[PDB]
């Protein structure tokens, strides 16, 4: 049964490849050669947020852009005030290891995931007293790699035992589960309409997931290694993925295959995070040789290098209005770039 | 209004800074340890007033490459072992030759003293006579024990360069305490560039 089913899968994958190849008419470079390039704009460090002790593993901006949340490994979750470099709230963490942090679009909830398999939700308003754990989502059996909010009530989480899950807070149970990959789901990003979330895993697979349905519509296999971090193009029609083979690839949703690949011979280190600018002409990628090369998104050129850090950059965030870029590295410094 | 909010923000920022100072003091007092043979189990103890938080992975899937990278900050990894021995050797080599684990010292424990079939290099082996065999035992057990220790040493010496060290031991808390003190003293000598 295995041999005939394997033959059928081989035939069908060949059909999907042939169909994508027939739909492939050009590369993005051929048509977009006639555009003015960015040239070079280097950025200047403007703020330096030094309050952490251990390495800063994840940072998340807020929709207000006044405030950012950063999570270290010393068990401290700190809500910085990026304009006036002050610490609004510092929160103690029950478990030392925290691999992600998420900040709500209302600015009332902060979600931190660790190795302890328990997503925690912190209420910020708290007229009774301090910020405190309110409800904790404990369903996964691997670890929790990334987490994101859809609204104040429902939170999507990417586990490390292959099952992405959609969570409800006031009940506490998984509304739905996503079971597509064969690997550790590293990072998920959300579309700007918040109906579809891409998933990055360790089997070099990018998948498109529908939130209400719970099925993977598409599969993007163009990487040679695991996908560290994934970011949508800011309209919701494409996305970029970062891997450990020193390639950032731009994947198209509706043409279903890779538009462009950002890789140069002098780069032999893994991408840890990818992000876009406001318009999307600039692609920001954190690299493992301690700097953040900036990529011209339509021309595949290196616009500039953000070389302020001293250790591995772990997280990289861009504000909603696009004013600044804040990178976080393992030397316990958040550098805000303009 | 503005004066009140700035003064209040100064007070809140100073209170948070003082809390971070207290946390820094207790954090530096703490020597984290990793034991690899609820997603994570914590064992806390203290030997001569020095606090050791030891963490053991709980229900973690067997693929190890992603989550281990977080553990580079640790002082030492306690590695306990018992064709199982070859898998343990391959694991130790992977930990030793990682791009991020070059600063962590590995502390090695040889539990369940042993076999002979899997290693046709064992027949050509002689006991290290610089070392002192522990009395009241079996010559074959001693020969096998030192043979396994030598295999771990040969894996260790490949591109070691003094960045991090491997300590081999036999079966427990005092041994870990002495080894952690040794690692800290070597790290301090490296800072002053005496070594």
């Amino acid at each position: 049964e295995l041999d005939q089913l394997r033959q059928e899968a081989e035939q069908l994958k060949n059909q999907i490849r042939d169909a994508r190849k027939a739909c492939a008419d050009a590369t993005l470079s051929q048509i977009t050669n006639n555009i003015d390039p960015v040239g070079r704009i280097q950025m200047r460090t403007r703020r330096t947020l030094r309050g952490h002790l251990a390495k800063i593993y994840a940072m998340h901006w807020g929709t207000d852009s006044r405030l950012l949340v950063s999570a270290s490994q010393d068990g401290k979750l700190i809500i910085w005030d990026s304009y006036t470099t002050n610490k609004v709230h510092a929160i103690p963490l029950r478990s030392s290891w925290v691999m992600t942090c998420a900040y709500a679009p209302s600015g009332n909830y902060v979600a931190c995931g660790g190795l302890d398999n328990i997503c925690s939700i912190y209420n910020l308003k708290t007229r009774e007293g301090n910020v405190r754990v309110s409800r904790e989502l404990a369903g996964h059996t691997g670890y929790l790699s990334c987490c994101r909010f859809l609204d104040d009530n429902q939170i999507v989480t990417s586990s490390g035992d292959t099952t992405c899950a959609l969570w409800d807070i006031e009940t506490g149970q998984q509304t739905t589960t996503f079971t597509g990959h064969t690997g550790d789901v590293m990072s998920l990003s959300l579309a700007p309409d918040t109906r579809l979330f891409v998933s990055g895993a360790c089997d070099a697979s990018a998948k498109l997931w529908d939130v209400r349905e719970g099925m993977c519509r598409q599969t993007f296999t163009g990487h040679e290694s695991d996908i560290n971090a994934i970011c949508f193009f800011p309209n919701g029609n494409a996305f970029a993925t970062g891997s450990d083979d020193a390639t950032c690839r731009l994947f198209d949703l509706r043409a279903d295959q890779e538009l462009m690949t950002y890789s140069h011979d002098n780069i032999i280190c893994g991408i840890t995070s990818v992000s876009f600018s406001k318009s999307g002409r600039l692609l920001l990628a954190g690299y493992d040789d301690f700097n953040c090369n900036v990529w011209d998104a339509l021309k595949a050129d290196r616009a500039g290098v953000l070389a302020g850090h001293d250790n591995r950059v772990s997280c990289l965030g861009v504000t909603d209005d696009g004013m600044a870029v804040a990178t976080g590295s393992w030397d316990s410094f958040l550098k805000i770039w303009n | 209004d503005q004066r009140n909010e700035e003064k209040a923000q100064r007070e809140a920022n100073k209170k948070i800074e003082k809390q971070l100072q207290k946390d820094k003091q207790v954090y530096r007092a703490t020597h984290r340890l990793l034991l690899l043979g609820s997603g994570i189990f914590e064992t806390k103890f203290q030997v001569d007033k020095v606090n050791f938080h030891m963490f053991d992975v709980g229900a973690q899937r067997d693929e190890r490459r992603k989550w281990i990278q977080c553990f580079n900050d640790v002082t030492a990894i306690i590695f306990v072992v018992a064709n199982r021995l070859q898998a343990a050797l391959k694991l130790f080599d992977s930990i030793w030759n990682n791009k991020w684990l070059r600063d962590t010292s590995v502390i090695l424990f040889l539990n369940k003293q042993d076999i002979e079939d899997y290693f046709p290099e064992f027949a050509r082996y002689t006991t290290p006579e610089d070392a002192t065999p522990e009395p009241g035992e079996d010559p074959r057990v001693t020969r096998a024990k030192y043979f396994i220790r030598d295999e771990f040493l040969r894996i260790s010496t490949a591109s070691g360069d003094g960045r991090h060290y491997c300590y081999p031991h036999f079966t427990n808390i005092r041994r870990v305490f002495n080894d952690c003190r040794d690692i800290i003293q070597r790290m301090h000598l490296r800072q002053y560039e005496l070594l």
């Epitope: 690997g183 089997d203 | 899937r61 067997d62 490459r65 694991l91 030759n97």
Partner: nanobody, 126 residues
Framework: QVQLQESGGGLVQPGGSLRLSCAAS????????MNWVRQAPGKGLEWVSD????????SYTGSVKGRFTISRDNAKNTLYLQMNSLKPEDTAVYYC?????????????????????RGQGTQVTV
């Protein structure tokens, strides 16, 4: 799309010179330290041999010393295993595998719970 295919195997007279060939498609071959992993039936996966990025660093399991030869060519991008003087108790499925990152030395691919980049294997009966 990354897949490792294996050609060879089958019944062999004990002692027979059977060769296993792994064909790599979907990645740059010259950058990955590629290894062979075998699963005996009713037994977890066990590493056999590995060869480095160039073809200089070669290592074996203790039980397969001096009987198995591992050689890699970059141009035909194939991981080639030569087995000589076989034994009936060492019969197993043989999986071609790839260590997950370029330009590195460490590997984490003994894991039976579906490592993402190994091949599907060939039964090899002695």
């Amino acid at each position: 799309q990354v897949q490792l295919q294996e050609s060879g195997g089958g019944l062999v007279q004990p002692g027979g010179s059977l060769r296993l060939s792994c064909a790599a498609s979907g990645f740059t071959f010259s950058n990955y330290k590629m290894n062979w992993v075998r699963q005996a039936p009713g037994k977890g996966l066990e590493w056999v041999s590995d060869i480095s990025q160039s073809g200089a660093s070669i290592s074996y399991t203790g039980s397969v010393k001096g009987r198995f030869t591992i050689s890699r060519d970059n141009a035909k991008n194939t991981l080639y295993l030569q087995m000589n003087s076989l034994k009936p108790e060492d019969t197993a499925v043989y999986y071609c595998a790839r260590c997950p990152a370029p330009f590195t030395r460490d590997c984490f691919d003994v894991t039976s719970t579906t490592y993402a980049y190994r091949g599907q294997g060939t039964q090899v009966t002695v």
